[PDB]
Every structure is written in structure tokens, then in C-alpha cells.
Ligand binder design. Structure first.
Ligand SMILES: C[C@H](CCC(=O)NCCC[N+](C)(C)C[C@H](O)CS(=O)(=O)O)[C@H]1CC[C@H]2[C@@H]3[C@H](O)C[C@@H]4C[C@H](O)CC[C@]4(C)[C@H]3C[C@H](O)[C@]12C
Ligand SMILES: C[C@H](CCC(=O)NCCC[N+](C)(C)C[C@H](O)CS(=O)(=O)O)[C@H]1CC[C@H]2[C@@H]3[C@H](O)C[C@@H]4C[C@H](O)CC[C@]4(C)[C@H]3C[C@H](O)[C@]12C
Ligand code: 118
Ligand code: 118
Lengths: 268, 268
């Protein structure tokens, strides 16, 4: 049986048989020496059936080679099974994210706020945890901290890139009684003089949105991130962070400012 | 911000930014014309945020290069959603098949049979449906009936490959007096003669199991397929076929006879 007849018996392409002969998965029963013509046999079909049976389970080709040439490989079927359930979990996550994306696109004609899930590494910060009378007043006590720390900690170099964020320890929304905590990432440890203390913040997987524009429409992004959290079955594991990437310090226009809100979450 | 600092901001590889600038998505703000250095801005951070948000949803990159500038394209999200739904339903199918595979290596010391789905196209066959008392007389009675057909039908030529098979139109287990229907695919219509008629047998999806060995143990393959159909959440749609690939016509030793059982099946 030539390769054209075998490809019609097997209902597979000829190039598939060429590839399987090249890699050594399915070798023809007899190859004509002068022409090169591959000839196949029923005993090759009995093996192509096994190849197809394994390949329909999503096994990679090299896994199929290992399974059919070397027996007692029950660890490879377990690896493929665990990977299949992991991919199923990831696929359910992706499905929820794309359903949410369509309900939002069908909600507002322009999408102002995309949501991205990113992992934040561990870091060394100096932090001051304090009760703030108003969000407008929160901005006032930060530049005092910025000069005082550089005067009190000489040669202290902030990391690059600059991770300067806020920990919202409030489990509910309020305007005037915010128990907030100002953090700023630094390269190495230091002295803990004053109300400013040093600490490490654990690496977290967090869903983040970057808000461009003034600080009054941030409630939109928070409700959106909360909406994302309720829609996609995540649970808030830690306090939300507020990372100030660009602001009045690089650019004078207040509507081009940008900050990224991070929601530490786990899928539950 | 040079490509290294920006790549540290986004926690992404420099090769990713190089590739992106190559394909046109996320071109940097300023390309130094002297040395080719790529400099980035926070506006590229905002473009990359949504790039990564779509990439985390499964969209291919060439889908992203249309999705992020032709913002009104909305069919590509329900399209990606239906595509992911098809992939998840297949992954869940594969998961049931691998757990079943594992159960079978627990049940039997050897994976003697290996099931595999295949699509059997529609075909014009000559068919004779009747009741037979046993297997020995049925096996003996087939070849004279074939000589009768191939002689009495001038111009009738067999199909390449040679698909000769049987259907079992019973509903309960009959070891004897089995309402069997023999068919053999022909390239074109011949005229009916007596109890043998011609018809076109519809294209089906079927699970298949090859049995290399004597004929008195093909019932085991059916048992395996029945367990496979009941376990893996499948349903027998039509009468189970049995295709004769190799037999008394090509080889004289019974221990190397290879026959393939086909169960027309659909998933629940
Ligand atoms: C969902 C979240 C708890 C979890 C609640 C509890 C504390 C709330 C923030 C603070 O009020 C400060 C600030 C007020 C602005 O008005 C809107 C933005 C800010 C960041 C609020 C957003 C959001 O509503 C927070 C994080
Ligand atoms: C499990 C299955 C039920 C399906 C519903 C039972 C019911 C009818 C049974 C077949 C017939 O008996 C004919 C034939 C007899 C041979 O001896 C063994 C093969 C055949 C094809 C049998 C296989 C199997 O045993 C069948 C499909
Ligand atoms: C210590 C030192 C600098 C800043 Sb800032 C800032 C950030 C958020 C809200 C208000 C101010 C800063 C600068 C670069 C990168 C990230 C943050 C700052 C610097 C100069 C002038 C005004 C403000 C804060 C603490
Ligand atoms: C018409 C009907 C049946 C057979 Sb065959 C057979 C031949 C070639 C390829 C496939 C099948 C047969 C039997 C004895 C001698 C010569 C040919 C046949 C036998 C048993 C069961 C099914 C088919 C041949 C023509």
C-alpha cells in the first residue's frame, strides 16, 4: 500500500505521513530503495490508530513517541491530566473575562477602562499609616515626607522603576475617615526613625486598571474593579494599592495624569 | 525611558517590545535616528496595558492589531467567546477521556484496545439485511454472495480504499439469529437484485477500535466501546458498524487478522 492509498485509508494528509516517518513515529513497512517510495501495511495502520487515539487527547507528538516506544509511562498520562485540568481552570477564567468584556462593551460604547491581571514582586518600602481627614488633604502631607526622609536618610536611593503607592486599609467606602497608608518602594532596608517605618510588602497577584485623568473619577474605576471582582469570582486578599505613575511632577496638565489601581485577588 | 527601564516597568521582556515594535502594535514614541535606541512614554504604558489585557483573554496578536485600532469591531469578541467555548467543551471531553484511560490501566494490566474518533463519509453501498443463524455460516456465506454480485453486475467496480462492512440492527444481545446487514461501498449506483438492495449510507462520526487477532474475541472490543460510551458521556446514535480490514481473503493465519469496529456515536 503506497502512501496515497494509506493516507486515504487513514484519512490523513500525505505530509503527515512524511512527518511521522521523519520523526520516527510511524515508519513505513518497506521503503523502496531507488525511488524512495514508502509502502505501508496493516501493521502500520494498527499503529496509526494508536497515534490518533493519543493525539485526540491532546498529547504532544514527543509524548506520543515516549508512550508508544517506552511502556510503564503512567506519570506522563498524569502530567497530561493535571495540565488539562489546569488549562480548564484557566479556560473558565478566560471565559468569565470575555463574558465580562462583552457585557461592558455592550454597556458603554467606548471602553475607558481595561482590566489586566499582573503579578507584583516583593518590595522594600518606607510607609506611614495614618488616618486622613479627606482625600484632598491626603496630597498635602506627602511632600513633607518626601523632603524629610531624604534629609533623615542620607544616600537612601529609591528603586527603579519607582513604585510609589497607597494601601487602603478601609474595608468600606467613606470620604472623611480614610485609614490610609502611604508606601514608597526603596532599594535597601534602613532606619525606622519617626512615624515612617520600613517593611517588605509580599509579592501579590493583582488585577490592575490604569486611570488616566483627574482624581475625581477614580470611583468609576474602583466600582469597575469591584464589578470585575464580583463577576469573575475573585476574592480580595489584601489591601488595595494606588500606584502614582505620572502626575504633576512630570507634566503640568492634570487631565493627562495617570495612576494604576491594584486589587490583590485570588480566584475563589 | 529606554527599552530596559520600560521593560522593567511593565515586567516584560525586551524581546517582547522588539517584536511588538516590529509588528506595528505599540511602536515607541521616539526612535533615536542615530543609534536606533527605542525610548518609551507612559502613553505606551497605557497602550501596553490594554495589549496585555487582550492577550490575557486569548486573542491572537494579529487579532489585537485589528481590535485595538478598529475599536468598533464587535463580532470578534462573541467569535472569540464561541471559539473558547468550543475549546473548553473539547478540553472537558479530553479530560473525561484521560481519566477513563487511567481507570482502564487500573482495570486491565495492558491497554489492549485504544478507542479513537473518526469521521466516516457517506457512501453508495450495496446492502443485504437479513437474519443469520450463526457466525460460521455467515462467514462462509459472504464470499459466494460477493462472487454473485461482482459477476452479475457488469461494469461495477469497487472503491479505493475497499470499505466492506456489516451493521447490527438488533437492540438486545443476540449470540445467534442476528439481524445483520452486510454492505460494501461502490463508486456508483447499481441495480437492485432480489433481497440485496442499493442505498447511500450517511456520513457519521464514530468511535473506532481495532482488534488484531481471531474473531471470537471481538465482543470484548464492543464491551470496551460500551464502557467507553457509557463512561465518557457518549451516546450510540445508530447501529454499530464492523469494518473488515484484513481477514481470510488476504492472510491465512488467524492470529494476524485485523478488524476494526466502528460505533456511530455522539457526545452528551
Ligand atoms: C472598595 C474599597 C474597599 C475594598 C474602598 C474602601 C476605601 C475606598 C477608597 C477611599 O475612600 C479613598 C478614595 C476615595 C475616592 O472618593 C474614591 C477612590 C478611593 C481610593 C476609594 C476607592 C474605593 O471605594 C475604596 C478603596
Ligand atoms: C452491548 C451491545 C448492546 C448495545 C445496545 C450488544 C447488543 C447486541 C450485541 C451484538 C449482537 O449480538 C451481534 C454480534 C454478536 C457477536 O457474538 C458479538 C458481536 C455482536 C455485534 C454483538 C456485540 C455486542 O454484544 C452487542 C452490540
Ligand atoms: C516622596 C518623594 C516624592 C514623591 Sb512624588 C508624588 C506622588 C504621588 C502623589 C503626590 C506626589 C513622585 C515623583 C516621581 C515618581 C513618582 C512619584 C513628587 C515629586 C516632585 C514634585 C512633586 C511630587 C512622594 C514621596
Ligand atoms: C464482494 C463481497 C465480499 C468480498 Sb471479501 C474482500 C475482498 C477484498 C477486500 C476486502 C474484502 C472475499 C472473501 C473470500 C475470497 C475473496 C474475497 C469478505 C470476506 C469476509 C467478510 C467480508 C468480506 C469481496 C467482494
Amino acid at each position: 500500500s503506497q502512501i496515497g492509498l494509506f493516507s486515504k485509508i487513514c484519512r490523513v494528509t500525505i505530509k503527515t505521513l512524511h512527518y511521522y516517518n521523519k520523526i520516527g513515529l510511524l515508519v513505513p513497512a518497506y521503503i523502496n530503495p531507488d525511488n524512495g517510495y514508502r509502502f505501508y501495511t496493516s501493521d502500520q495502520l494498527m499503529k496509526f490508530h494508536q497515534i490518533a487515539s493519543l493525539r485526540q487527547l491532546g498529547f504532544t507528538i514527543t509524548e506520543i513517541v515516549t508512550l508508544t516506544q517506552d511502556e510503564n509511562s503512567c506519570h506522563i498520562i498524569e502530567r497530561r491530566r493535571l495540565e488539562i485540568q489546569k488549562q480548564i481552570r484557566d479556560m473558565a477564567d478566560m471565559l468569565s473575562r470575555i463574558n465580562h468584556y462583552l457585557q461592558h462593551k455592550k454597556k458603554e460604547r467606548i471602553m475607558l477602562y481595561q482590566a489586566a491581571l499582573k503579578e507584583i514582586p516583593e518590595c522594600i518600602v518606607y510607609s506611614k499609616r495614618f488616618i486622613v481627614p479627606d482625600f484632598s488633604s491626603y496630597i498635602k502631607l506627602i511632600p513633607p515626607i518626601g523632603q524629610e526622609v531624604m534629609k533623615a536618610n542620607p544616600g537612601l536611593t529609591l528603586t527603579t522603576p519607582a513604585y510609589c503607592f497607597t494601601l487602603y486599609h478601609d474595608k468600606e467606602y467613606k470620604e472623611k475617615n480614610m485609614d490610609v497608608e502611604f508606601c514608597e518602594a526603596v532599594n535597601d532596608f534602613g532606619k525606622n526613625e519617626g512615624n515612617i517605618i520600613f517593611q517588605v510588602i509580599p509579592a501579590i497577584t493583582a488585577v490592575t486598571v490604569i486611570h488616566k485623568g483627574p482624581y475625581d473619577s477614580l470611583r468609576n474605576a474602583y466600582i469597575y474593579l469591584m464589578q470585575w471582582v464580583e463577576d469573575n469570582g475573585y476574592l480580595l486578599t489584601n489591601s488595595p494599592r494606588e500606584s502614582y505613575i505620572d502626575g504633576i511632577w512630570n507634566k503640568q496638565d492634570s487631565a493627562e495624569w495617570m495612576t494604576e489601581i491594584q486589587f490583590p485577588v485570588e480566584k475563589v
